[PDB]
Amino acid sequence: MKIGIVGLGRVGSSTAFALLMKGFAREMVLIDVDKKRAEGDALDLIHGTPFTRRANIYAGDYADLKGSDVVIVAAGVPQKPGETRLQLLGRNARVMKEIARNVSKYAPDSIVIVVTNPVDVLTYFFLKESGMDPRKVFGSGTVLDTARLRTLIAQHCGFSPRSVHVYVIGEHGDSEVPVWSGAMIGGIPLQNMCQVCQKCDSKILENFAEKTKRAAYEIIERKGATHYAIALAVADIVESIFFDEKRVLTLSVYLEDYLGVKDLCISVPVTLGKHGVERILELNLNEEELEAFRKSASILKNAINEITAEEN
Amino acid sequence: MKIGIVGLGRVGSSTAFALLMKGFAREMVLIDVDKKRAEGDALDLIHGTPFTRRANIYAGDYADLKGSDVVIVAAGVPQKPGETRLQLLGRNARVMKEIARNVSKYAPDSIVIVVTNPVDVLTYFFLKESGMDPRKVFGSGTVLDTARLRTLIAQHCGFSPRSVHVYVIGEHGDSEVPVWSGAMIGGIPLQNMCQVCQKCDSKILENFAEKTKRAAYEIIERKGATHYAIALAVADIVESIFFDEKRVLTLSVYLEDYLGVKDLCISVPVTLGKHGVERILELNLNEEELEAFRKSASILKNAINEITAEEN
Amino acid sequence: MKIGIVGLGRVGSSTAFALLMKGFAREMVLIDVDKKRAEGDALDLIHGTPFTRRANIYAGDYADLKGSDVVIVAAGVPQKPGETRLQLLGRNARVMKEIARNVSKYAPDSIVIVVTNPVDVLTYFFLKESGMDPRKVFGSGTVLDTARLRTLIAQHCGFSPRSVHVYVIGEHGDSEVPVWSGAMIGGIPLQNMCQVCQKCDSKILENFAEKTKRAAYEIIERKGATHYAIALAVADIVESIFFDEKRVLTLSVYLEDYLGVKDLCISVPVTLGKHGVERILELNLNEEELEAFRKSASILKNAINEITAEEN
Amino acid sequence: MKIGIVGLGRVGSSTAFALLMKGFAREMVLIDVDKKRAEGDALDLIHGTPFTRRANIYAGDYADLKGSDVVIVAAGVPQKPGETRLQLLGRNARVMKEIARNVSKYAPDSIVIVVTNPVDVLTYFFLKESGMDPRKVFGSGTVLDTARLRTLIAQHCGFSPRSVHVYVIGEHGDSEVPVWSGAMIGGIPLQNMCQVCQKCDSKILENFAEKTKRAAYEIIERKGATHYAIALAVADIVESIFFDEKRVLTLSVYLEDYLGVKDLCISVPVTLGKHGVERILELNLNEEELEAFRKSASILKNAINEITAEEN
Numbered sequence A, B, C, D: 001m002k003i004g005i006v007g008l009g010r011v012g013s014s015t016a017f018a019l020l021m022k023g024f025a026r027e028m029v030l031i032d033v034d035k036k037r038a039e040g041d042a043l044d045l046i047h048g049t050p051f052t053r054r055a056n057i058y059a060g061d062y063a064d065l066k067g068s069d070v071v072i073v074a075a076g077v078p079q080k081p082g083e084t085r086l087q088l089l090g091r092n093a094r095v096m097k098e099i100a101r102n103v104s105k106y107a108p109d110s111i112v113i114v115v116t117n118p119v120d121v122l123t124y125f126f127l128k129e130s131g132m133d134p135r136k137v138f139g140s141g142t143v144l145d146t147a148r149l150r151t152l153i154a155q156h157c158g159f160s161p162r163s164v165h166v167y168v169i170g171e172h173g174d175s176e177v178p179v180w181s182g183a184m185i186g187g188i189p190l191q192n193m194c195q196v197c198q199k200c201d202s203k204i205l206e207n208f209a210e211k212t213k214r215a216a217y218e219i220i221e222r223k224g225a226t227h228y229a230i231a232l233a234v235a236d237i238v239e240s241i242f243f244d245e246k247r248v249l250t251l252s253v254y255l256e257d258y259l260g261v262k263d264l265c266i267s268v269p270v271t272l273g274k275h276g277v278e279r280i281l282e283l284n285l286n287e288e289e290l291e292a293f294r295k296s297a298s299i300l301k302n303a304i305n306e307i308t309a310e311e312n
């Protein structure tokens, strides 16, 4: 397939390298405002193709997205000194809208995966300005945090991550919700299995939830940014579209009305295939989860409203 | 690793071909009473290695199992005319015991996977005569029927088989038990999800259970025997030992006491790694399931007792 | 892609199983005159798909080849008692012509790979009766014998088969020609490298040529037939069409005039891609090789002429 | 296997990410003088392991190399302003010696692959200070430039890179030597095949030689540095050790006396397996090639001598 990447920073370039090794792209267009950087990146990957699958990689402009099966948006600006988070978001939101008109124009039939943070806020702004199908434009969301929570549990208990079931939903941020009420290992409720398993107990499941929601912060304090993790997750998402797998992924999707939350992009279990999102799984949230989920949706709508209100 | 296959009939040879393409064997010993057939089989696979991974394949005798990481038993005799099923089993049971002393003698440290039918009856006879660890000798059991039930459901509902959870336990035969009470799709109970999904409803889940328990009969009426399906399942089991995955598989294991069934080999969810079986998952069976499961164990013990009683 | 297999005997079925594990077919049609056998084969492979890629496999009739990207012909009859080889060939040649009209009719745009023996004689009869493009219909030829000769040499000398160059051309039979004059290891002529390498010398390269041309005979004396080797080679050929690789393969192609041989199907280095054969490499044969090659072409034309003459 | 990476700059980290996706490391130790950067890198890759194979990745110190099967050296310092190339090399050479004593001390049984530029000069300094086996310590050399030259030719002519033979030897720099005299496509000399092929002719083969020796310069002018290409090449080299393939690679090896060049590390065709380098292929260089090769060795020895002379 043909893949376009808009924004070749640490994440865009890592995503490109990963997609290259997976071998999903026949043609790969790299688009960044700093054309010189995008071109050197393209030549570097081209110089490594003798060890990967043949791919037509090149640094282009928006007109090249024509024919793109998937367009990945890893484009954004860095917080200026003094700069406020609302301002920062104001700038990034404007970046999203700009890229959107162009993707809408040259690649109207593509599937777009937004990756920049805040992912749920920026995906909503991109979708709105784009005017495309909500089943074909979405954000990576909590996909990575869900997989990470399943992995921590699995390796502590002596199981394959394949045997562990858990979903983290909501804002891909401080207010995400691990849905512990539907968690299992071997289909057996996470609580029986948790205290059969030795290196498991209540204090440890809480650490996990905490180790996963802090992962990015901890990487950033040490090296300024995360790019590898999200790169591998974007490859994994693309992998489901590529083979039309219909796997369930907690992607940030535009929901018309899900458990009382409305008109916003947020993460919930949906199935992904070659035509984009298909089924949205409505979860049976216990009381505390429903409340946390709802509060999450409100933190997002508020942010959406402050920005929509500070550009008018 | 080094793999030995004892019994190169339709199943043994198909299993060997499949294992060859997976590339799990560095050395592969083929043992059959008809040495001429085993040798031509070995030369044929050797002649195809230019397209697979290097492997040291050869037709040997029992002394060659020395060093075997895994030994697969697909050895058995065909029902003579007039021959009774009890007699037939009497003969096959004797085959199992014979192979057992030899495997015990030359490859005491291997992991053995019994595949011949009746799988639960013959595995029990093999284990007993062998005197090996019940965590390292087991039968393939209901592994294939479980995967097949998950696949039917999945493709009818528009999900990846990875999102479907169901276990079929008990005798790998007419009395197997699909554990519908713990069935799910996306962690959501199979009943909500079943009637959200269009090509699903009660009459169809019953067909599935029936299509999967009859699969072998239907193949046999048409071509005399099954070998491809079981070959792919044996490869899959070996794959878990090979990468030490700890995946949950409904293998036929020797149970000391599981839900009131005792002293017999039967299928239940257990985890498989490089050292053999590790955890046995005790399932929460509803009333009717517990009863079906128990009846299953009784059909097996009876058969075990009739044969143990018609060789003394 | 969609693949049809006409003739599900030991080879056709082995080829189907192998193609299934490679995961090249989205849809697979099995056609055999013994419909009951083809159907049980289809159900067996279907029952194993939970461990492979989703594939639409089924036993059909000629009308189903519609849309086939590749059609494999492993169909043929066995020598009756008393039966002469010329007669036998007369029968098989008639089988080839029959299958040809049907493939021409329902799948005129497919790429056909003939596999039945004698491969060069039967491919020529199939092509002629079919009236299709000589670049899209061909026989597997010496593909397997070439790979096997490269492998023997490589493993004796301590090199990867990738570093060994040799071609065996001509009749895929007793008169095949290993082109020793262009043989190399690391691009260094096989003779310098041969006596630098310890387990190499003139008497051993001759054994190799002999071990490879006798491989099938030796398998057949032991188990009645070869099927695994050729199955893996057919998968490998299909693999080049599938990813459009343009790899060089000694396939049995219809040559209009190559080194003085004319109007016949015989093996020589040609490149294979998604559209079939592309380039035919004309080799620089030394004196003795040119003579052996020519004699080979004459043994084939003679056989072609005796059969064309004993059906008129 | 266990892999250590010393120097996590753009190349070290790219190499780590690539090795991670290949799945060659069971345990991966990242060592950089800037421990904070190495630790954030380790956490980032760990956070992405839910999508790759289980691996024990962590930022350590030299004592952790204990047990390392392979150690990769991508460590070096950047040219200070005003700084001379000889000085720069003086500094980097000292870095190499330092890392060497430590690798010699804690991981004496590992295979080391030097990657920093100048690769042939720095590998020689590392080997000398280390006192290890010349068959287990070497530089990546011209591996990437050789593959790139084979790829350019192949895709222009309509062949698989597998069918193209060419070696580039000598200094991995401005004086590298493409050995055109032994170049082939399908074993047919590159000159016949070159003017049979349309998009090939003398002016184009020269462009190729030029496009490949300038690749890094062109990347660097655009984005300051190359890391992806070399990362994929290092993975490929590790891949040969990992599966003990014995593939021929133009690695920078210590040569005692090869075609009159002596006591230096330079690139030539050697075979690589699980125990390191095995066979060194002595090439039949025509006149002009022998001269270019020799001049190459002299440019390297001179540099080696100026540095050995400006630290005493």
Ligand SMILES: NC(=O)c1ccc[n+]([C@@H]2O[C@H](COP(=O)([O-])OP(=O)(O)OC[C@H]3O[C@@H](n4cnc5c(N)ncnc54)[C@H](O)[C@@H]3O)[C@@H](O)[C@H]2O)c1
Residues within 6 Å of the ligand: A006, A007, A008, A009, A010, A011, A012, A031, A032, A033, A034, A037, A074, A075, A076, A077, A078, A092, A095, A098, A099, A115, A116, A117, A118, A220, A224, A225, A226, A227
């Ligand atoms: N650690 C992280 O990865 C992290 C942390 C916080 C926020 N973010 C957000 O997510 C984004 C992705 O992070 P990154 O580290 O890969 O970014 P980065 O530091 O590489 O910056 C963005 C890249 O996108 C490009 N770009 C900007 N505007 C563009 C436009 N209009 N059209 C095309 N290309 C454009 C820039 O030129 C730059 O190359 C960030 O820009 C930021 O807003 C990321």
Ligand SMILES: NC(=O)c1ccc[n+]([C@@H]2O[C@H](COP(=O)([O-])OP(=O)(O)OC[C@H]3O[C@@H](n4cnc5c(N)ncnc54)[C@H](O)[C@@H]3O)[C@@H](O)[C@H]2O)c1
Residues within 6 Å of the ligand: B006, B007, B008, B009, B010, B011, B012, B031, B032, B033, B034, B037, B074, B075, B076, B077, B078, B092, B095, B098, B099, B115, B116, B117, B118, B220, B224, B225, B226, B227
């Ligand atoms: N459709 C089926 O696959 C099927 C159906 C019913 C029962 N079974 C049972 O499972 C077994 C596997 O089926 P198959 O179709 O692959 O078998 P098969 O028809 O090929 O027969 C068994 C093979 O095992 C070999 N063998 C027998 N005793 C041996 C011994 N003592 N030591 C070494 N090798 C020995 C035989 O020589 C023969 O090659 C059968 O023997 C049978 O008892 C299979």
Ligand SMILES: NC(=O)c1ccc[n+]([C@@H]2O[C@H](COP(=O)([O-])OP(=O)(O)OC[C@H]3O[C@@H](n4cnc5c(N)ncnc54)[C@H](O)[C@@H]3O)[C@@H](O)[C@H]2O)c1
Residues within 6 Å of the ligand: C006, C007, C008, C009, C010, C011, C012, C031, C032, C033, C034, C037, C074, C075, C076, C077, C078, C092, C095, C098, C099, C115, C116, C117, C118, C220, C224, C225, C226, C227
């Ligand atoms: N060892 C070998 O593999 C070998 C040796 C000598 C010759 N051959 C030749 O190559 C062929 C392939 O060998 P095999 O062992 O796989 O064959 P086989 O023994 O399975 O016999 C051929 C199969 O092709 C089917 N078939 C025959 N005519 C057909 C038709 N007109 N339409 C559709 N299907 C048809 C038959 O029903 C049978 O299922 C042989 O038929 C023979 O002529 C093979």
Ligand SMILES: NC(=O)c1ccc[n+]([C@@H]2O[C@H](COP(=O)([O-])OP(=O)(O)OC[C@H]3O[C@@H](n4cnc5c(N)ncnc54)[C@H](O)[C@@H]3O)[C@@H](O)[C@H]2O)c1
Residues within 6 Å of the ligand: D006, D007, D008, D009, D010, D011, D012, D031, D032, D033, D034, D037, D074, D075, D076, D077, D078, D092, D095, D098, D099, D115, D116, D117, D118, D220, D224, D225, D226, D227
């Ligand atoms: N474009 C290129 O990749 C390029 C171009 C010219 C030269 N080089 C040479 O090859 C090397 C690899 O290039 P890069 O771009 O990946 O480097 P880089 O810019 O990331 O710099 C080197 C890294 O190695 C680390 N390091 C330095 N000394 C160390 C020590 N003694 N122990 C442990 N870690 C140490 C540094 O802290 C830094 O993280 C360069 O340092 C340079 O000497 C590379």
Ligand SMILES: O=P(O)(O)OC[C@H]1O[C@](O)(COP(=O)(O)O)[C@@H](O)[C@@H]1O
Residues within 6 Å of the ligand: A039, A042, A057, A058, A059, A060, A061, A063, A064
């Ligand atoms: O929209 P555009 O300008 O056609 O972009 C694509 C073209 O630019 C190129 O990628 C070259 O770009 P760079 O010169 O910047 O490397 C061509 O290879 C490609 O066909």
Ligand SMILES: O=P(O)(O)OC[C@H]1O[C@](O)(COP(=O)(O)O)[C@@H](O)[C@@H]1O
Residues within 6 Å of the ligand: A162, A163, A164, A165, A166, A184, A186, A187, A247, A248, A249, A269, B162, B163, B164, B165, B166, B184, B185, B186, B187, B188
């Ligand atoms: O591992 P099993 O036996 O399929 O059962 C549970 C796993 O499947 C699940 O439905 C999860 O599926 P997904 O994660 O693909 O949505 C949960 O039950 C858990 O994730």
Ligand SMILES: O=P(O)(O)OC[C@H]1O[C@](O)(COP(=O)(O)O)[C@@H](O)[C@@H]1O
Residues within 6 Å of the ligand: B039, B042, B057, B058, B059, B060, B061, B063, B064
């Ligand atoms: O127990 P044994 O007789 O050593 O068996 C193994 C030996 O037999 C062989 O496999 C050859 O067997 P065949 O001659 O029957 O083909 C050797 O290659 C191998 O080393």
Ligand SMILES: O=P(O)(O)OC[C@H]1O[C@](O)(COP(=O)(O)O)[C@@H](O)[C@@H]1O
Residues within 6 Å of the ligand: C039, C042, C057, C058, C059, C060, C061, C063, C064
């Ligand atoms: O040319 P036809 O008869 O449509 O053949 C294909 C059809 O036959 C089937 O394969 C079933 O064949 P069998 O009943 O013989 O198994 C269908 O699944 C398929 O759509």
Ligand SMILES: O=P(O)(O)OC[C@H]1O[C@](O)(COP(=O)(O)O)[C@@H](O)[C@@H]1O
Residues within 6 Å of the ligand: D039, D042, D057, D058, D059, D060, D061, D063, D064
């Ligand atoms: O030589 P050392 O200090 O044991 O290094 C390895 C140890 O450091 C760790 O990698 C942790 O390193 P960081 O705390 O820097 O992340 C452990 O996980 C590991 O066992």
Ligand SMILES: O=P(O)(O)OC[C@H]1O[C@](O)(COP(=O)(O)O)[C@@H](O)[C@@H]1O
Residues within 6 Å of the ligand: C162, C163, C164, C165, C166, C184, C185, C186, C187, C188, D162, D163, D164, D165, D166, D184, D186, D187, D247, D248, D249, D269
């Ligand atoms: O592609 P073939 O037919 O093996 O022949 C040539 C290729 O093999 C070669 O020996 C090259 O081998 P390596 O590149 O592995 O050393 C050359 O002849 C060319 O690289």
